[PDB]
Ligand binder design. Structure first.
Ligand code: RET
Length: 137
């Protein structure tokens, strides 16, 4: 059941708390928290192959992966990492991340398309879980 589409954010929970764990400067946190409620997300899914574009005025990223194959992306705070996505269930994928260089909080993300048509993203750093909920444009 396919996640392709243009998605608009409706709620963002614990994003500032996540940025705190990641050590992001407070003045930057305020800007990023504001931008998080205005983001645009585009997904192109063909089976296990994904393209994801996340766009805001301060931050934009493009993610490319196939489920089950290691790939490179960045942590939320911008550090290059090695990632691997697996299906946890029919509708929900989970990504484990490992920094290329250095140490820091354990980070991961999940993405799920629900029965009622919401896309739910979670992003985790150590004990803090941020949840962002999207609906189709
Ligand atoms: C599967 C969906 C993924 C992996 C989405 C990742 C989205 C981000 C890493 C978003 C990051 C943002 C910032 C770093 C600051 C501006 C607000 C966000 C939420 C767009």
């Amino acid at each position: 059941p396919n996640q392709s589409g243009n998605w608009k954010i409706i709620r963002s929970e614990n994003f500032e708390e996540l940025l705190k764990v990641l050590g992001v400067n407070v003045m930057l946190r305020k800007i990023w928290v504001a931008a998080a409620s205005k983001q645009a997300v585009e997904i192109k899914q063909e089976g296990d192959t994904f393209y994801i574009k996340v766009s805001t005025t301060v931050y934009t990223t493009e993610i490319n992966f196939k489920v089950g194959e290691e790939f490179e992306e960045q942590t939320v705070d911008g550090r290059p990492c090695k990632s691997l996505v697996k299906w946890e269930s029919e509708n929900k994928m989970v990504c484990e991340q490992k920094l290329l260089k250095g140490e820091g909080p354990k980070t991961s993300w999940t993405k799920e398309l629900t029965n009622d048509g919401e896309l739910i993203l979670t992003m985790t750093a150590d004990d803090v879980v941020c949840t962002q909920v999207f609906v189709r444009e």
